[PDB]
Design a protein around this ligand. Structure first.
Ligand SMILES: [Mg+2]
Ligand SMILES: [Zn+2]
Lengths: 330, 126, 237, 191, 63, 38, 158, 176
RNA sequence: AUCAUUUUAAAAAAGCGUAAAAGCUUAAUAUUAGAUAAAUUAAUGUUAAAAAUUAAUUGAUACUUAAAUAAUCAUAGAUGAA
């Protein structure tokens, strides 16, 4: 007698032809290479923040001799802060028996994991290292991009030499420094930093198979066809999901209060673009034999270098004139 | 002022919505209040709109059906497709993407048959 | 217009309300240009100190205030918020209206004289006012506002009234003083224009002219042209 | 202000009516905001309905709508079991309406009326069951309470009043004559 | 003023003698001089000055 | 393109785009309106 | 097809519609037959004097089809007849010299209403007030005159 | 507020799941072949219609990345049991092609060879001046379709050369 | 010169366009959906009413007046970061 929402009214919904029904006798991989899906959106969008992990950065060890050892993992602190304290420990500035007129130093340094280095910001790409080689012209600049990949070990050994006091005692000190790319040192009788290889599975947030079925609830379902892969969960269907945001009890309402909050969230996302990790992208191969994309055989040398006489069709073979089809099956 | 000489043509990218239709049937309950007016506006866009971008045999109607559960928008396309969309809960925007989900495919069906269902470039400039 | 013509013909009689209403406002204003409304206005404020400098206030969005006093009276200088000041303009009556300032239990009458704004930056520098006291002369600006009259015969046709002065400076000696002046120019003509002494003869007893400011009573305000056709016929011939 | 907390509830209401009932609200703002803020928290403790009568008649000049509802929402909870109480609400609710100019320009339709009948539906039993129990001082205030309220329903009390005057016609005062002659003249919406 | 257009003139009626009855059922508002014994000797001397003086000053207050 | 320090919009269709520290104007009608700031 | 390509205003004599080359500049490139066109015009306007110039509109279409529509003559020309002048003032408002009386306005408004499709909804005060503002732009006034004028045939460009 | 819309095709059927704790909310798509899930924060509220297979989103978090989240989500589902399509043309005198088993041979006034070779596409000729590509990913298609375009494109003076069948074309007068 | 009418609204037009015409867009505007309009101060004690309340602020949105702060860019010389 008045407007009551119906319950069981939905018509059939037209089913479209599948690519097998429409294009048999052709490459299956067409309808099986699915669309790309960038993961990095999701963790930002649907709110995954990695737990703050706080691993070790450096370490100081003594022996019954006078000799002390200073150990560093360059993947955990920045480069400069690692290099300041080296020059502060390599001398003995923490050792209260410090005379700068000493011909002898019982302080030794070790470094490890020099491949991966922390550089806060957009500095691994822009900053450079310059020098001159006696001859005219000269003035060779080089990028961190060269060191951080090919030989990153001059860099750590080059920045130390700039913080140390400019004198003759330097070489004796820098003779007592050692760097490694791997996660080890070869010395024996000393410890080694454990690497952090794990990566947080965020699976508990977007997967029922991780949780137990009795803790969960179904609030909505489309079909009368119920999956067998989902069995044991209740069905307490809300009357509330399908209601748009006007027909509900609580409405989010733009207002001087929430708009004031809106602007706080807006600065947050601008205030975070600054705290973003940039990476040296690697060089690239363009072998057509590897990619899933199409390509061109513009020239002849692209054949020999890649052995593409196969996928090229011979010239001694007929052609295809017109491939229209009138009737589309169902 | 000054005379344009670069002519930017935008006729081929023109993709209206009701173009692949053969007919339509509005359905109205006088007890709806949200599902009436949505169907009012569609019936205008079926006739108030331009006939170039429609078929030749396009006939839209309107009927008051008290017996229905909800007011509906039934439709029929060229190559066989047929559907109904009740309107007591939806919007005008949720409907259009359904129409694109058909109109985008009928091109993939008719182009394979050889039919040029596209427009000249000179129809609408910027 | 907003209703079809075919329905308006049925309701053409209704539009008397339109025209009968405009009788009421435009006549009311035309006779109420002269009178101050009887409504008290108040401005809470604070004293001056040597501490509160300008630029200190102007980040706090306050404003300085200045008052000039009269015979035997000392000057007074105060502090106030900007939005008070603009609201004081935003009345009709700003040219003359009496505004008070409550510091504490004290109240100081004033008038608007003017305001200065920093033109390149366009923020409020100060708000200047003039003291008013009852028993002593006080400068005010009485604007002139001329009514229309379809009762004279030359004014109706092809002639032009000329208002050479917008207002008059005077000295008032009593509480309630007139907002403005209103004139009915029927008896005027090309032969005689209005002169300030024709106003000086018709004022209350509490008012006088500030001769220090005006030039001479024989000065004239409202002038009337001759006819246009009598020129135009002569212009062509 | 040094001893606000030492007061009971109603001994603050007496300040409201003592100051705000006339042209200058003699007290300050802060001293009244204090009274205005305490009372609408402690409505759960004012014992009687007369104590609401004093309250509403003093707080009638409020500009905020939000707290009149708190009062009337309370009165809809506390039933009345006598007759002097109902008189003590009409005569007060009459003068102490919330005017429509203070209300917003956009609003539910005729929402001023819905504020009334929450009371009048809450009173209609008591004033109707025992209207024979009525006397000359409590007599006048009903004719006024209804005429000020613009209704046409309360005839039954009036019929019990028609029978009342004629009996006591001779023993009346000079005061109880005008209000009758002025009351019955415009009984049911100036009929 | 707006006031002249929404004012029930109080002349033509001994208002306060009439108006105080209709509230008199409200006990807490009933003023009581003798409730304030320390100043009652003072406050009442003032009211003599009111009525006894020329004109009708207190009688013109609300009126 | 032409390097205008003080950029300027000629037609309504002109619009601004920022690629990092880079700034420029482009037009969908007149490709001569486009600029750069340097 | 039924879509409207273009609209043109014209001016024609009633029964002397004829393929003048000074109208093919407009209707030439649209492929319309001036001869077949003017036939249907003169056929309708046989109940009208031939000296009079009317105006017409033509919704020229995409297939070079047409649908002609007839309107009353130019409102200015009708007044020059009554006024017995051919050319009017350079200026307006300042130079006011001409005079008609109302008793013909009430008669020439009926011309517009009896024919023009736009005024079918309209009353006569409405139409009469339309020309008075057109008269203000021309040097014309509305003043009572007992006399009648004598005939005049002011020009038209045709 | 912008209330973004998530389309779902008709072949797909879905469910929506929550805890008793109501602190977690996620959604499950399931087809004959595939299955796919994704969650929603506590700050994203949701509305569903079976009438349209559309879902509506509000975001109290005010993240602007969601507008990209849509296009991935929408196209990733229509990428199941449906193609994307595109069409290419040309107009000219000394132009042609030849087609042999997803290996298109182009001859457009160039000294060098111009073979086009499709890895995991479909290519079917409808006329001499027309060819359609078909593939399930839209992003590989354009990289596959545009390589054909770069050989010759539309002259701004004459519409002679290749072009897509839906595009903004430029023209400029010449030799009046 | 700036009138007037039909319209729910539409400038003898603020502009592009034409050999002159035609044609295109803004101002003004409608249908539908979504959707901002929230907080307060001062007055005549109580009697007019099928009815009507003044002066005034702050704030959300759009138009409008505009200024200020912060960062970025605004070409560089001659043995080699300089
Ligand atoms: Mg016009
Ligand atoms: Zn441009």
């Amino acid at each position: 007698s008045v407007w009551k929402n119906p319950t069981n009214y939905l018509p059939e919904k037209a089913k479209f032809p599948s690519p097998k029904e429409l294009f048999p006798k052709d490459n299956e991989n067409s309808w099986k290479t699915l669309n790309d899906l960038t993961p990095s959106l999701f963790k930002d969008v649907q709110g995954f923040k990695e737990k703050q992990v706080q691993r070790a950065a450096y370490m100081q060890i003594a022996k019954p001799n006078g000799q002390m050892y200073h150990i560093f993992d360059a993947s955990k602190m920045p480069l400069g802060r690692m290099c300041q304290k080296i020059a502060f420990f390599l001398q003995g500035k923490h050792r209260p028996t410090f005379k700068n007129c000493d011909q002898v130093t019982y302080d030794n340094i070790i470094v490890v994991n020099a491949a991966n280095i922390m550089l806060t910001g957009k500095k691994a790409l822009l900053k450079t290292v310059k020098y001159h080689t006696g001859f005219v012209g000269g003035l060779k600049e080089k990028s961190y991009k060269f060191f951080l990949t090919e030989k990153p070990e001059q860099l750590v050994f080059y920045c130390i030499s700039k913080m140390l006091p400019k004198n003759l005692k330097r070489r004796d000190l820098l003779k007592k420094v050692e760097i490694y790319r791997d996660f080890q040192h070869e010395k024996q009788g000393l410890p080694n930093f454990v690497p952090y290889t794990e990566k947080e599975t965020f699976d508990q947030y977007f997967n029922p198979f991780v949780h137990n079925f009795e803790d969960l609830v179904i609030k909505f379902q489309s079909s009368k066809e119920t999956p067998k892969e989902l069995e044991g969960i209740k069905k307490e269907i809300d009357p509330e999901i399908t209601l748009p945001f006007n027909q509900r009890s609580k409405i989010f309402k733009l207002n001087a209060h929430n708009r004031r909050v809106m602007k706080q969230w807006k600065m947050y996302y601008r205030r975070l673009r600054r705290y973003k990790v940039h990476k040296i992208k690697a060089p690239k191969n363009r072998d057509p034999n590897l990619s899933n994309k199409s390509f061109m055989i513009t020239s002849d040398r692209q054949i020999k270098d890649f052995n593409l006489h196969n996928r090229i069709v011979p010239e001694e073979v007929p052609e295809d004139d017109d491939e229209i089809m009138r009737t589309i099956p169902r | 002022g000054k005379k344009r000489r670069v002519q930017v043509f935008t006729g081929s990218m023109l993709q209206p919505l009701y173009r692949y239709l053969l007919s339509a049937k509005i359905g109205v309950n006088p007890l709806d209040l949200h599902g009436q007016n949505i169907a009012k506006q569609i019936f205008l866009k079926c006739k108030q709109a331009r006939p170039k971008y429609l078929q030749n045999d396009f006939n839209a109607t309107l009927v008051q059906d008290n017996e229905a559960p909800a007011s509906y928008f039934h439709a029929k396309f060229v190559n066989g497709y047929e559907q109904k969309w009740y309107l007591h809960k939806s919007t005008e925007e949720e409907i259009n993407r359904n129409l694109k989900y058909f109109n985008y495919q009928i091109e993939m069906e008719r182009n394979l048959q050889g039919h040029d269902d596209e427009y000249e470039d000179e129809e609408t400039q910027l | 217009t907003i209703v079809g013509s075919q329905f308006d013909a049925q309701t053409e009689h209704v539009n008397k309300l339109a025209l009968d209403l405009a009788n009421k406002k435009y006549r009311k204003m035309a006779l109420d240009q002269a009178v101050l409304r009887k409504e008290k206005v108040v401005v809470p404020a604070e004293f001056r100190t040597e501490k509160d400098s300008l630029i200190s206030l102007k980040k706090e969005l306050r404003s300085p205030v200045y008052i000039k006093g009269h015979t035997g009276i000392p000057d007074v200088d105060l502090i106030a918020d900007n939005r008070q000041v603009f609201s004081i303009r935003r009345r009709l009556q700003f040219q003359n209206q009496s505004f008070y300032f409550k510091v504490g239990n004290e109240e100081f009458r004033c008038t608007y004289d003017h305001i200065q704004i920093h033109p390149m930056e366009k923020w409020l520098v100060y708000s200047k006012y003039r003291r008013y006291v009852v028993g002593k002369p006080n400068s005010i600006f009485l604007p002139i506002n001329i009514l229309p009259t379809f009762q004279n015969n030359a004014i109706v046709r092809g002639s032009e009234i000329v208002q050479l002065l917008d207002g008059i400076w005077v000295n008032s000696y009593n509480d309630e003083y007139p907002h403005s002046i209103v004139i009915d120019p029927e008896n005027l003509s090309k032969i005689r224009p209005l002169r300030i002494g024709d106003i000086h003869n018709f004022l209350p007893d509490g008012v006088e002219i500030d001769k220090t400011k005006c030039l001479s009573l024989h000065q004239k305000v409202i002038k009337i042209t001759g006819d246009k056709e009598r020129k135009l016929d002569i212009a062509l011939q | 202000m040094q001893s606000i907390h030492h007061y009971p509830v109603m001994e603050l209401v007496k300040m409201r009516y003592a100051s705000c009932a006339l042209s200058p609200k003699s007290l300050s703002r802060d001293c009244l905001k204090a009274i205005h803020d305490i009372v609408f928290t402690e409505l759960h403790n004012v014992p009687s309905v007369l104590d609401l009568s004093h309250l509403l008649f003093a707080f009638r000049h409020i500009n905020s709508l939000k707290y009149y509802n708190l009062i009337l929402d309370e009165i809809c909870r506390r039933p009345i079991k006598t007759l002097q109480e109902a008189i003590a609400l009409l005569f007060v609710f009459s003068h102490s309406l919330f005017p429509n100019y203070k209300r917003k320009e956009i609003r539910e339709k005729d929402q001023d009326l819905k504020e009334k009948h929450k009371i009048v539906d809450h009173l209609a039993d008591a004033l109707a069951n025992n209207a024979k129990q009525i006397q000359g001082d409590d007599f006048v205030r009903v004719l006024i309470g209804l005429n000020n309220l613009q209704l046409t329903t309360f005839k039954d009390v009036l019929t019990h009043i028609e029978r009342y005057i004629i009996k006591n016609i001779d023993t009346l005062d000079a005061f109880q004559t005008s209000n009758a002659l002025y009351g019955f003249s415009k009984a049911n919406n100036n009929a | 003023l707006q006031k002249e257009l929404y004012f029930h003139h109080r002349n033509g009626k001994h208002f306060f003698e009439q108006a105080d009855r209709k509230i008199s059922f409200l006990n807490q508002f009933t003023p009581q001089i003798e409730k304030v014994p320390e100043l009652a000797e003072t406050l009442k001397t003032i009211l003599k000055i009111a009525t006894e003086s020329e004109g009708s000053p207190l009688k013109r207050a609300g009126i | 393109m032409k390097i205008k320090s003080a950029l300027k919009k000629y037609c309504q269709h002109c619009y601004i785009v920022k690629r990092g520290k880079k700034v420029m104007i482009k037009c969908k009608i007149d490709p001569r309106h486009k600029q750069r700031q340097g | 097809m039924a879509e409207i390509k273009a609209i043109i205003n014209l001016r024609l004599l009633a029964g002397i519609a004829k393929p003048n080359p000074k109208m093919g500049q407009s209707l030439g490139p649209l492929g319309i037959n001036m001869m077949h066109f003017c036939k249907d015009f003169n056929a309708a306007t046989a109940h009208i004097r031939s000296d009079i110039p009317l105006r017409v509109q033509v919704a020229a279409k995409v297939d070079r089809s047409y649908s002609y529509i007839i309107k009353p003559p130019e409102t200015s020309w009708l007044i020059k007849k009554v006024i017995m002048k051919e050319k009017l003032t350079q200026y307006a408002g300042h130079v006011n010299l001409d005079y008609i009386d109302v008793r013909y306005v009430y008669e020439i408004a009926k011309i517009k209403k009896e024919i023009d499709i736009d005024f079918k909804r309209a009353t006569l005060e409405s139409i009469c007030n339309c020309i008075i503002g057109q008269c203000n732009s021309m040097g014309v006034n509305v003043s009572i005159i007992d006399e009648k004028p004598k005939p005049f045939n002011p020009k038209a460009k045709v | 507020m912008k209330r973004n819309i998530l389309f779902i095709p008709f072949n797909i059927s879905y469910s929506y799941i929550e805890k008793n704790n109501n602190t977690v909310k996620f959604l499950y798509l399931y087809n004959n072949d595939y299955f796919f899930s994704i969650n929603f924060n506590e700050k994203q509220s949701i509305v569903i219609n079976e009438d349209t297979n559309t879902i509506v989103v509000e975001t109290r978090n005010f993240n602007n990345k969601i507008n990209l989240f849509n296009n991935e989500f929408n196209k990733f589902i229509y990428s199941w049991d449906n193609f994307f399509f595109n069409k290419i043309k040309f107009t000219g005198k000394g132009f042609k092609w030849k087609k042999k088993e997803t290996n298109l041979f182009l001859f457009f006034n160039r000294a060098h060879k111009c073979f086009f070779i499709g890895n995991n596409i479909i290519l079917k000729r409808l006329s001499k001046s027309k060819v359609i590509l078909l593939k399930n990913n839209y992003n590989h298609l354009i990289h596959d379709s545009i390589l054909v375009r770069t050989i010759r494109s539309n002259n701004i003076f004459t519409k002679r050369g290749l072009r897509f069948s839906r595009q903004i074309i430029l023209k400029k007068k010449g030799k009046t």
